[PDB]
Motif scaffolding. Structure first.
Motif, PDB file in Angstrom:
ATOM      1  N   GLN A  13       0.634  -1.345   0.127  1.00  0.00           N
ATOM      2  CA  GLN A  13      -0.068  -0.010   0.118  1.00  0.00           C
ATOM      3  C   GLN A  13       1.044   1.099  -0.044  1.00  0.00           C
ATOM      4  OE1 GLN A  13      -2.918   0.377   3.176  1.00  0.00           O
ATOM      5  NE2 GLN A  13      -3.629   2.361   2.185  1.00  0.00           N
ATOM      6  N   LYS A  14       0.749   2.159  -0.805  1.00  0.00           N
ATOM      7  CA  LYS A  14       1.239   3.374  -0.749  1.00  0.00           C
ATOM      8  C   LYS A  14       0.642   4.353   0.182  1.00  0.00           C
ATOM      9  CE  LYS A  14       3.461   6.670  -4.240  1.00  0.00           C
ATOM     10  NZ  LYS A  14       3.306   8.024  -3.618  1.00  0.00           N
ATOM     11  N   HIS A  15       1.178   4.350   1.296  1.00  0.00           N
ATOM     12  CA  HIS A  15       0.576   5.350   2.424  1.00  0.00           C
ATOM     13  C   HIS A  15       0.651   6.851   1.770  1.00  0.00           C
ATOM     14  CE1 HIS A  15       0.461   1.833   5.070  1.00  0.00           C
ATOM     15  NE2 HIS A  15       1.939   1.744   4.818  1.00  0.00           N
ATOM     16  N   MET A  16      -0.241   7.383   2.033  1.00  0.00           N
ATOM     17  CA  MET A  16      -0.356   8.944   1.926  1.00  0.00           C
ATOM     18  C   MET A  16      -0.028   9.802   2.829  1.00  0.00           C
ATOM     19  SD  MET A  16      -1.420  11.812   0.641  1.00  0.00           S
ATOM     20  CE  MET A  16      -1.477  12.908  -0.862  1.00  0.00           C
ATOM     21  N   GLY A  17       1.342  10.058   3.019  1.00  0.00           N
ATOM     22  CA  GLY A  17       1.754  11.046   4.076  1.00  0.00           C
ATOM     23  C   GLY A  17       2.898  11.865   3.787  1.00  0.00           C
ATOM     24  N   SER A  18       3.938  11.626   4.669  1.00  0.00           N
ATOM     25  CA  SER A  18       5.274  12.334   4.278  1.00  0.00           C
ATOM     26  C   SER A  18       6.475  11.400   4.435  1.00  0.00           C
ATOM     27  CB  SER A  18       5.467  13.692   5.051  1.00  0.00           C
ATOM     28  OG  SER A  18       4.299  14.492   4.768  1.00  0.00           O
ATOM     29  N   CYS A  34      10.347   5.176   6.549  1.00  0.00           N
ATOM     30  CA  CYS A  34       8.828   5.111   6.847  1.00  0.00           C
ATOM     31  C   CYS A  34       7.722   6.241   6.191  1.00  0.00           C
ATOM     32  CB  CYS A  34       8.420   5.618   8.312  1.00  0.00           C
ATOM     33  SG  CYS A  34       9.554   4.724   9.529  1.00  0.00           S
ATOM     34  N   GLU A  35       6.469   6.099   6.231  1.00  0.00           N
ATOM     35  CA  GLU A  35       5.697   7.230   5.988  1.00  0.00           C
ATOM     36  C   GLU A  35       4.897   7.493   7.399  1.00  0.00           C
ATOM     37  OE1 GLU A  35       5.782   8.526   3.065  1.00  0.00           O
ATOM     38  OE2 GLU A  35       3.957   9.427   2.587  1.00  0.00           O
ATOM     39  N   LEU A  36       4.724   8.814   7.713  1.00  0.00           N
ATOM     40  CA  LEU A  36       3.989   9.469   8.677  1.00  0.00           C
ATOM     41  C   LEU A  36       2.677  10.266   8.274  1.00  0.00           C
ATOM     42  CD1 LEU A  36       4.392   9.532  11.582  1.00  0.00           C
ATOM     43  CD2 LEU A  36       6.014  11.447  11.078  1.00  0.00           C
ATOM     44  N   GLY A  90      -7.366   4.304  -0.335  1.00  0.00           N
ATOM     45  CA  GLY A  90      -6.043   4.075  -0.756  1.00  0.00           C
ATOM     46  C   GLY A  90      -5.604   5.111  -1.798  1.00  0.00           C
ATOM     47  N   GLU A  91      -4.362   5.610  -1.714  1.00  0.00           N
ATOM     48  CA  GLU A  91      -3.638   6.304  -2.792  1.00  0.00           C
ATOM     49  C   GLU A  91      -3.401   5.234  -4.071  1.00  0.00           C
ATOM     50  OE1 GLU A  91       0.561   8.298  -4.170  1.00  0.00           O
ATOM     51  OE2 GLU A  91       0.051   8.316  -1.952  1.00  0.00           O
ATOM     52  N   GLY A  92      -3.015   4.154  -3.534  1.00  0.00           N
ATOM     53  CA  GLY A  92      -2.463   3.145  -4.702  1.00  0.00           C
ATOM     54  C   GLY A  92      -1.236   2.343  -4.097  1.00  0.00           C
TER      55      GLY A  92
END
Ligand code: AMP
Ligand code: MG
Lengths: 407, 218
Positions: free
Chosen positions: A78-83, A154-156, A305-307
């Motif tokens: 999963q492409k988490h949508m954060g920073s 990581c993604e936050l 989800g973003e993708g």
């Protein structure tokens, strides 16, 4: 002057004058202590455009990228949508001083892709670092890896925690102006329709603007999904996807199933702040396995989800002597309205967007990937700081090379 | 993105002759980076309303940074609205109306609505620009996102004008005053057309109390 860097994966990478000066700016004015900066993450390429009706990106093309280059298995995450957040944890402040040379008494850091502290408030950073320290404490991580430090990639979340100025000045500005005039347009045309240069048809116009309106509404729903208020550390979500380095070891020899598994076990148990990543394994040679990948991606993105990020099973992979993308992004149809625009799915638009060139973007990723790997290996083998720093600085410099921002 | 003009003196369909557009025939005009549509949502003896709709292409616009691709330009009354007014209502702006020359020569009771005018200086600038021309001016504003009131308010205003004015003056006033608020006009067209739509002030503008402000923003 010009700067030539040598890496194990690519023996020659040039850093041009323009890029070095643009990097020097952001590096000296806003960056954290360079003693913590042992790595910067690379930019990432998307796939070839899809052919499938009304689709710009689709799993098939990313699967095909690897299959035609000899890679039989990929891991979809999963492409988490954060920073993007680089998270370094030491057992204590004495470890940070000894191993890293850090003098300000901190025992960890969370920084961004440009090398700045993620949080303006140190206490909030220290708090986050401490939650990660405890999870590693209880899982037995330090002992099992014989290390007193760890560097996680990581993604936050949420996105809005870092992007609020963008949301205020750009995204929600398009959304309010768009929703208001498009609804008024539909209403006027409907009234014209009922009371019924070149000649136009009123009903076609009404149909068109009704469609523009429905897309604008979906664009607004799409950006909102990745925003929520943050009143304390408990509103945040950290999702690590790579264990990059521990004492004596860069973990670039481990496959992505290993990363997913090891992270879930050592980092995500009994603390909802630190989440596991939804992932699947795909045999890109097999029709059934590819069908599962597609189905899984369709469900993920339908639920907001973003993708996905499509990665080769092995961390670093080559087709003969040719280095391959360590990652390919494949983003949802609805998510992409935030990138290509609220109305990109309309026929006359989406057709003009299929002819995009990812050659330049692919080359930037390989070069940045190679600098990051090299930074990590130089640090893990205890080379002086300036040798680690030049690779990290190199990543920053390449990121100032102009390129299509929608990729 | 939308301009409406409403007229209620019976027979109100006279608005059609004055604007040189048949209320029964919707039209599309070509612009740089898209199209403009004109049509009449209402046309009776008692009430006539004309609508001018911008149809901006986001792709061709950008081909002419992330926010070069995703921006508010297709959805606001920027200088594009002025360019469209000249392309669609050019004869009316000149004052010609051979079918109803008497109506074209006098003050008519008129109402106009300009949606989503971006204005950095707020309501104040809008009043200073339109009130001295004698309009009764109504302004309404918007929050960026009602689900996120903490993001605060937008810089968009929907403006209502009402007054007794010649058709050509109403058109000229809007044509010239809209770009005064467009802080990014020199970006989306630059020089050629901007000069063209400042020449049109050659009268009331020299007497407008905000002449400095207006000449400055250009
Ligand atoms: N599972 C993941 N693996 C790698 N990158 C990820 C993942 N989830 C989210 N990302 C982010 O996705 C970015 C790639 O491009 P996007 O379109 O932001 C990376 O820089 C990461 O910050
Ligand atoms: Mg992102």
């Amino acid at each position: 002057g010009k700067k030539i860097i040598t890496t194990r994966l690519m023996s020659s990478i040039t850093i041009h004058e323009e890029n070095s000066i643009a990097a020097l700016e952001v590096m000296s004015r806003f960056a954290a202590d360079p003693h913590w900066l042992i790595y910067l993450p690379p930019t990432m390429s998307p796939c070839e455009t899809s052919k499938k009706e009304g689709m710009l990106e689709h799993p098939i093309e990313a699967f095909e990228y690897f299959r035609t280059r000899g890679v039989g298995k990929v891991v979809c995450e999963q492409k988490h949508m954060g920073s993007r957040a680089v998270v370094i944890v030491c057992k204590d402040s004495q470890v940070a001083e000894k191993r890293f040379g850090v003098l300000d008494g901190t025992a960890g850091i969370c920084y961004t892709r440009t090398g700045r502290h993620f949080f303006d408030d140190m206490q909030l950073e220290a708090e986050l670092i401490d939650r990660v320290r405890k999870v590693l404490d209880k899982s037995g991580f330090w002992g099992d890896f014989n290390t007193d430090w760890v560097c996680l990639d990581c993604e936050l979340m949420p996105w809005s925690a870092k992007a609020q100025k963008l949301l205020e000045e750009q995204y929600s500005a398009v959304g309010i102006s768009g929703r208001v005039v498009l609804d008024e347009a539909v209403k006027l045309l409907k009234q014209a329709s009922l009371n019924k240069g070149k000649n136009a048809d009123i009903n076609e116009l009404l149909q068109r603007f009704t469609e523009r309106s429905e897309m604008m509404q979906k664009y607004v729903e799409a950006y909102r999904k990745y925003c929520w208020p943050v009143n304390s550390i408990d509103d945040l979500k950290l999702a690590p996807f790579h264990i990059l380095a521990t004492e004596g070891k860069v973990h670039s020899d481990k496959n992505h199933i290993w990363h997913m598994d090891t992270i879930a076990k050592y980092c995500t148990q009994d603390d909802s702040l630190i989440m596991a990543t939804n992932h699947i394994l795909v045999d890109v040679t097999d029709a059934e396995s590819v069908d599962k990948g597609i189905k899984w991606w369709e469900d993920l993105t339908a639920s907001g989800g973003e993708g996905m990020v499509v990665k080769p099973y092995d961390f670093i992979v080559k087709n003969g002597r040719e280095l391959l993308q360590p990652a390919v992004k494949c983003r949802g149809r609805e998510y992409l309205r935030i990138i290509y625009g609220p109305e990109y799915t309309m026929d006359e638009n989406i057709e003009r967007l299929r002819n995009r060139a990812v050659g330049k973007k692919r080359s930037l990723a390989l070069r940045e990937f190679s600098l990051g790997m090299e930074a990590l290996e130089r640090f893990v083998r205890n080379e002086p700081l300036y040798r680690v720093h030049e690779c990290v600085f190199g990543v920053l410099a390449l990121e100032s090379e102009p390129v299509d921002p929608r990729l | 993105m939308i301009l409406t003009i409403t007229y209620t003196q019976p027979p109100a369909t006279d608005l059609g002759y004055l604007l040189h557009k048949n209320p029964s025939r919707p039209q599309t005009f070509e612009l740089n980076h898209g199209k403009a549509h004109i049509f009449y949502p209402e046309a009776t003896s008692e009430r006539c309303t004309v609508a001018l709709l911008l149809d901006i292409d986001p792709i061709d616009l950008a081909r002419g940074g992330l926010f070069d691709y995703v921006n508010d330009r297709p959805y606001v009354s920027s200088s594009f609205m002025s360019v469209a007014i000249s392309r669609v209502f050019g004869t009316a702006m000149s004052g010609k109306c051979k079918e109803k020359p008497e109506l074209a020569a006098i003050k008519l009771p008129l109402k106009a609505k300009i949606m989503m005018l971006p204005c950095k200086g707020g309501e104040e600038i809008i009043y200073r620009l339109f009130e001295p021309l004698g309009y009764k001016v109504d302004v309404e504003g918007y929050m960026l996102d009602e689900k996120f009131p903490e993001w605060g308010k937008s810089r968009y205003y929907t403006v209502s004008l009402e007054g007794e004015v010649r058709v050509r003056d109403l058109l000229n006033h809007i044509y010239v005053l809209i770009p005064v608020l467009d802080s990014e006009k020199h970006y989306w067209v630059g020089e050629d057309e901007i000069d063209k739509l400042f020449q049109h002030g050659e009268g009331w503008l020299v007497d407008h109390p905000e002449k400095e402000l207006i000449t400055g923003r250009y």
